[PDB]
């Protein structure tokens, strides 16, 4: 549909609208924050919910974070709605196939 295709190409839809209750971002990523700190060089409590959403293992998530950020700034990333697209993009193209 429209929202996963947008989230593949651009920002995940974070605007709560005249839908049922919420946006596509809180529908997929159950409880996170746009513009939050993410030390996914090591781990966090978000790391459960991102694997809930995308269906990734641990080292495949580490490799999918090696790309789309480079191997220099994996530690301190302030992920807005466009940086979650970098993770949704590389991990929903396989599962829709």
């Amino acid at each position: 549909s429209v929202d996963p295709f947008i989230a593949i190409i651009n920002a995940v839809n974070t605007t709560h609208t005249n839908e049922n209750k919420t946006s596509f971002f809180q529908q997929i990523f159950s409880t996170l924050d746009v513009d939050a700190g993410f030390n996914f060089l090591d781990q966090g409590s978000w790391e459960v919910i991102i694997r809930k959403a995308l269906g990734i293992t641990a080292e495949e998530l580490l490799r999918i974070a090696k790309y789309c950020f480079g191997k220099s700034s994996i530690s301190n990333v302030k992920m807005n709605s466009k940086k979650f697209s970098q993770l949704y993009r590389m991990a929903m193209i396989p599962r829709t196939l």
Binding site: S30, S45, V48, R51, K52, G55
Partner: protein, 48 residues
């Protein structure tokens, strides 16, 4: 820790395991609400 990280790919919000989670949670919550924290002037002892 183990309960927070067995929730990773298991216990999805569209499944049947979370129904059993909720059924085991209501049996604790109803009995605890019968134990404490109501207006105690009313005789509320059972689930009915």
């Amino acid at each position: 820790n183990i309960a927070n990280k067995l929730r990773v790919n298991l216990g999805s919000p569209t499944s049947t395991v979370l129904n059993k989670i909720n059924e085991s949670r209501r049996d604790a919550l109803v009995n605890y609400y019968l134990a404490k924290n109501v207006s105690g002037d009313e005789k509320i002892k059972t689930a009915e």
